[PDB]
């Protein structure tokens, strides 16, 4: 056999994997996925930082969806502080949690199309992802890595201008998905590339802890919304895709359905935002308006403190799962009660998937393997860390 | 943007495109908008605010 290192350099490798294969003629035998080419080691870097400082790190792991990561932190921090946010903040966190979900699935769709050489949808839809980055920029001042979701809730109130254009934005989008409906969804070549590839039995999934659509494609119905409507999801209407064959075609159609599903939800979140603070009343966690801090003393005092040593969590080490579109997400805090975490492991949903890939690798030809990475929505940033 | 070209385009489309404008024209929204004023906040009442309860 012929030993062969692959990426990072391949566009298919996404600049991260080095899964060496000891190929035969072209059928694989050995196929080990090395990792640690991106390992930023943030676990110790989280430890020496005040809990408000930890917040950027999560935009830094899921490159695409962003607000959901920070929400994944605000839930896990508010648990230990036992703090329950004003409702408007949660309607917002769902609203941009779902728009982040649109960005993430558009990402996975069009890139998976690129490895299949489709080219066009990419350019047909990033024209839209700039349309959304215009929005995170309108609410954060940054096109991406917006810090707008916070443990107290949110940095700032929504500008008056959005509420119309966002509707306008989704006034037409369904058609843009129709344009895909007229492609890969029906297209002949596409089925052959993906049909009956990387099928996974329900048990291996339940063993490795597969989650999200990666379960839902092979028929396991496990979900992190309706099982635990941790926010406004309990009020929100939507319905969950489940695959049949475990075909990548299945998982695909699921993601398209979830995109439809956010088309359903975001409608209702636009339909239902209360007036109210988008932040907690407490100045011992949530900082004062610039107007009030510059007259009232105590506001300026606690202002000075949260921005210097910050709120103090009561001591405790805990773990929380998150409904990332990619799967269960890991928030393993270890806090001595000091604003510095003692430790903080972060389970990436894609970690288990990549652990499971080699099971799906062997006995498949290389194009199958290139199909597989796109099967699992894996942004490698979260995975090694 | 000529109408015959619109006809032939929507023709190939199988869909009206004029019914869902793709390129974002005039409507958008105004950048310069009147001030937010913001919600007052539930616990800015002066009659009571002991930390013993809100905590």
């Amino acid at each position: 056999n012929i030993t062969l290192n692959f990426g990072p350099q391949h566009p298919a490798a996404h600049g991260v994997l080095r899964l060496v294969m000891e190929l035969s003629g072209e059928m694989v035998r050995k196929c080990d996925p090395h990792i640690g080419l991106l390992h930023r080691g943030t676990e110790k870097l989280i430890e020496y930082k005040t809990y408000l400082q930890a917040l950027p790190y999560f935009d830094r792991l899921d490159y695409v969806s962003m607000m959901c990561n920070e929400q994944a932190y605000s839930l896990a921090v508010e648990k230990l502080l036992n703090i329950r946010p004003p409702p408007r903040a949660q309607w917002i966190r769902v609203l941009f949690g779902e728009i982040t979900r649109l960005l993430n699935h558009i990402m996975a769709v069009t890139t998976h199309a690129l490895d299949l050489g489709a080219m066009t949808p990419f350019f047909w839809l990033f024209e839209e992802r700039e349309k959304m980055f215009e929005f995170y920029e309108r609410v954060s001042g940054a096109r991406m890595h917006a810090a707008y979701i916070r443990p107290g809730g949110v940095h700032q109130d929504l500008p008056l201008g959005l509420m119309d254009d966002i509707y306008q934005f989704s006034k037409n989008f369904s058609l843009r998905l129709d344009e895909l409906e007229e492609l890969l969804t029906n297209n002949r070549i596409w089925r052959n590339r993906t049909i009956d590839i990387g099928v996974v039995t329900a048990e291996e999934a339940l063993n490795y802890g597969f989650s999200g659509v990666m379960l839902r494609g092979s028929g396991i119905q496990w979900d992190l919304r309706k099982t635990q409507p941790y926010d406004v999801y309990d009020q929100v209407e939507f319905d969950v895709p489940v695959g049949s064959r475990g075909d990548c075609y299945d998982r695909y159609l699921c993601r398209v359905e979830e995109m439809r599903q956010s088309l359903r939800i975001i409608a209702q979140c636009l339909n239902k935002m209360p007036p109210g603070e988008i932040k907690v009343d407490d100045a011992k966690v949530s900082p004062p308006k610039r107007a009030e801090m510059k007259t009232s003393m105590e506001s300026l005092i606690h202002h000075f403190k949260l921005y210097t040593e910050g709120y103090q969590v009561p001591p405790g080490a805990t773990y929380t799962a998150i409904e990332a579109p990619k799967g269960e997400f890991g928030v393993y805090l270890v806090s001595d009660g000091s604003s510095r975490p003692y430790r903080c492991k972060i389970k990436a949903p894609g970690f288990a998937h990549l652990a499971g890939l080699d099971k799906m690798s062997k006995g498949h030809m290389l194009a199958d393997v290139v199909a597989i990475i796109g099967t699992q929505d894996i942004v490698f940033g979260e995975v090694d860390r | 943007a000529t109408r015959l070209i619109q006809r032939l385009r929507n023709w190939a489309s199988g869909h009206d495109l004029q019914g869902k404008l793709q390129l974002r024209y005039q409507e958008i929204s105004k950048r310069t908008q009147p001030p937010p004023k913001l919600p007052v906040g539930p616990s800015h009442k002066l009659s009571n605010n002991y930390y013993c309860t809100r905590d």
Binding site: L158, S174, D178, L263 | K37
Partner: peptide, 22 residues
């Protein structure tokens, strides 16, 4: 003048696809 942006109305949208046979 208290305000912010709660919804102004919001008309119908269709998450449902259409794929005409034409």
């Amino acid at each position: 003048k208290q305000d912010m942006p709660p919804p102004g109305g919001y008309g119908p949208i269709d998450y449902k696809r259409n794929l005409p046979r034409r």
